[PDB]
């Protein structure tokens, strides 16, 4: 109960929706022989379904009046009430990989600018240079702040403009 909400292990619409999905799977299962190949896949779907409900109720997700889990996207209401794995932990688990790709592509461009003709190594990617920059880009925030402290991250007004 952060903003009119309720834990999903407490709310009854969540359990009613679990029983609704298991009821649809059960009346779907009632047509087949108990050991046939469709019935095995239907019971495996039931097992994945029940494991999904158990692990959404276990992590302390907040349900609403609809019986559906919600995501508190504010630190200080996620850190204080234990919901940092909703948004606040994957908002850095994403940005590590985002700045990773943005650093690997940056360094692949800068390490191919100073050649004979760079464009041929942009349609035909130099794979050993690409995999070297793929592995050694693991510490990208480190190298990014060390590049920002120089001023070698930005370029000055050598850039191309029109008519200011």
Ligand X SMILES: CC1=C(/C=C/C(C)=C/C=C/C(C)=C\C=C\C=C(C)\C=C\C=C(C)\C=C\C2=C(C)CCCC2(C)C)C(C)(C)CCC1
Ligand Y SMILES: CCCCCCCCCCCCCCCCCC(=O)OC[C@H](CO[C@@H]1O[C@H](CO)[C@H](O)[C@H](O)[C@H]1O)OC(=O)CCCCCCCCCCCCCCCCC
- Residues in contact with ligand X by the rule CB under 6 A: 73-75, 87-88, 91, 99, 102-103, 106, 144
CA separation for the pair 71, 42 (Å, rounded)? 30
CA separation for the pair 20, 68 (Å, rounded)? 13
From the list ligand Y, ligand CLA, another protein, none, pick the one residue 76 interacts with, judged by a Cβ distance below 5 to 8 Å according to partner type: ligand CLA
Asked if 18 and 68 touch (Cβ cutoff 8 Å), the reply is no
**H/E element, 12:** helix 12-29
Asked if 70 and 63 touch (Cβ cutoff 8 Å), the reply is yes
Q: Which stretch binds ligand Y (CB under 6 A): 30-38, 52-60, 73-81, 130-138?
A: 130-138
Nearer to ligand X, 46 or 87 (CB): 87
Return the closest-CA partner of residue 11 out of 71, 58, 63: 63
Q: With binding defined as CB under 8 A, does residue 46 bind another protein? A: no
In degrees, rounded to 5, the angle at the alpha carbon of residue 141 between the alpha carbons of residues 96 and 110 is 100
Q: Which residue is nearest to ligand CLA (CB)?
A: 76
| Contact code string over 89-108 relative to ligand CLA, x by CB under 6 A | ----------------x---
Q: Which residue ranges make up the site for another protein (CB under 8 A)?
A: 48, 51-52, 55-56, 58-59, 61, 69, 71, 84-86, 89-90, 93, 117, 119-120, 122-127, 157-163
């Amino acid at each position: 109960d952060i903003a009119g909400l309720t834990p999903c292990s407490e709310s009854k619409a969540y359990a009613k929706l679990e029983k609704k999905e298991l009821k649809t799977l059960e009346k779907r299962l009632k047509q087949y022989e108990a050991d046939s190949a469709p019935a095995v896949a239907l019971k495996a779907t039931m097992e994945r379904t029940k494991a999904r409900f158990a692990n959404y109720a276990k992590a302390g997700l907040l349900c609403g009046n609809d019986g559906l889990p919600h995501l508190i996207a504010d630190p200080g209401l996620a850190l204080k009430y234990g919901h940092a794995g909703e948004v606040f932990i994957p908002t850095f688990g994403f940005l590590y990989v985002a700045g990773y790709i943005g650093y690997v592509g940056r360094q692949y461009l800068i390490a191919v600018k100073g050649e004979a003709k760079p464009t041929d190594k942009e349609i035909i990617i130099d794979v050993p240079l690409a995999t070297k920059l793929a592995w050694q880009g693991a510490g990208w925030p480190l190298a990014a702040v060390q590049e920002l402290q120089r001023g070698t991250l930005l370029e000055k007004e050598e850039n191309i403009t029109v008519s200011p």
